[PDB]
């Protein structure tokens, strides 16, 4: 998973 909730990972 991607732990950064303040950026779009996709």
């Amino acid at each position, epitope marked *: 998973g*991607n*732990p950064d*909730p303040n*950026a*779009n*990972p*996709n």
Partner: antibody
Amino acid sequence: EVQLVESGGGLVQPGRSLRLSCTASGFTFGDYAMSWVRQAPGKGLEWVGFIRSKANGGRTENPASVKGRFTISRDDSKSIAYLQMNSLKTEDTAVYYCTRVELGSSWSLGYWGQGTLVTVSS
Amino acid sequence: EIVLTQSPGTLSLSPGERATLSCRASQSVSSTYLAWYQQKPGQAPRLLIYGASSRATGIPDRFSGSGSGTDFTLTISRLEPEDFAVYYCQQYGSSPWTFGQGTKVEIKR
């Protein structure tokens, strides 16, 4: 004043589903990621997922330990975050907290609601 | 996952004394992604320190956080009656986000 009013908790049968609501006020709800954290009686804190802002894609992340049973969604027009919990087990009995994820490069959990107790039992 | 082990389990101290709380990570964590929370019984947690060392708003000067790598510390330099509580560390730099098991700072009488 930041308010994160959880509702929808209470008693639920093992195996059933329950949707929690977090009615937010006192801030620009649409700007923030929101996260749910739970605390089983007598135990510590466990993260059970977050959802990003619409500007950041609006997608969720959940811990593998929950085995895909939980879904987080948001309604920006009503400033409500949801936690949909399926296939509930007695181990899911806990106080469930709604939290606001802070903006910027250190995304800590800046604000926490009172939490709502979910009791999974027959 | 990154396991956070806190020590000690319970710290019994008198008001005015200094409390030192430890948080050990199973692998290294960037200090930007470590936070500390305070929780009292019947109450929700509240943020104390974020980014290992930055105080949240309204947190008095007697709270300070430090550390890097796998070892992080929360120091409460001169305990006031309202500082006695359980303290949790948290990392949010790796998925899943994880919390330590908590350290109880109880008032010694």
